C-alpha cells in the first residue's frame, strides 16, 4: 500500500496521493488533508486493516514509513545533511506514533530526491524502491512487478536471504 504524503514545514499533509494502485483504493474518500502526518499515517494503517489489504494479527507486519527530502529543498546543497537529520527525527516520531497499533512494527527509511522520482515512476514507496534497489545488488532476482503486491516484510527477507552467490 504505497501512498505519498506531501508535507509542509508545519508537518501537515498537503496532499495524499497514491504511489501504487493499492494505496489508491485505500485513500478513496479519505479526508486527511491539512492534518499532521503523525495522525494521517496512524489512520491510514488502521484503514488498511479495515479494507483487509494486510493482516493485522497474523504475520509480523512491517509497516514502512519512508521519507525523502524534496527536490526544491535540494536546490542547493549547503547543509542538506541538517534537513536530512531533522527528516530522520520526523520519521522517528511517525515510527513511535504508529507502532502503538496492534502488531505493527515500523521501519523508517530516509531517501533522496532520486528514490522518490524513481519510486513514483516504478509505482512504489521510496523505501520499497530503496530496498528493491539494494536487493538487486544483493541478488537481482527480484522483479519490480512482484514488489507491487509483496509485503515490505517479504522484501526484507529478499535482501537478507540474498543469493548472488552460487
Amino acid at each position: 500500500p504505497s501512498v505519498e504524503l506531501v508535507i509542509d514545514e508545519t508537518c501537515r499533509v498537503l496532499e495524499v496521493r497514491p504511489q501504487n494502485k493499492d494505496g489508491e483504493q485505500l485513500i478513496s474518500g479519505l479526508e486527511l488533508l491539512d492534518k499532521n502526518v503523525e495522525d494521517v499515517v496512524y489512520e491510514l494503517i488502521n484503514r488498511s486493516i479495515s479494507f483487509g489489504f494486510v493482516k493485522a494479527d497474523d504475520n509480523r507486519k512491517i509497516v514502512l514509513i519512508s521519507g525523502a527530502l524534496n527536490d526544491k529543498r535540494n536546490e542547493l546543497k549547503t547543509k542538506k545533511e541538517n534537513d536530512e537529520a531533522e527528516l530522520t527525527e520526523l520519521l522517528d516520531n511517525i515510527k513511535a506514533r504508529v507502532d502503538r497499533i496492534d502488531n505493527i512494527k515500523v521501519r523508517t527509511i530516509t531517501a533522496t530526491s532520486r528514490e522518490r522520482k524513481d519510486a513514483l515512476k516504478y509505482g512504489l514507496s521510496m523505501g520499497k524502491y530503496c530496498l528493491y534497489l539494494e536487493a538487486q545488488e544483493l541478488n537481482g532476482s527480484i522483479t519490480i512487478d512482484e514488489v507491487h503486491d509483496m509485503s515490505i516484510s517479504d522484501m526484507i527477507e529478499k535482501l537478507e536471504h540474498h543469493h548472488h552467490h552460487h
Binding site: 514545514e9 504475520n59 514509513i65 514507496s125 516484510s153
Partner: peptide, 10 residues
Amino acid sequence: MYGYICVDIN
C-alpha cells in the same frame, strides 16, 4: 516545502 513521506503499509 519540506518533504514527501512515502508510506507502504506492508
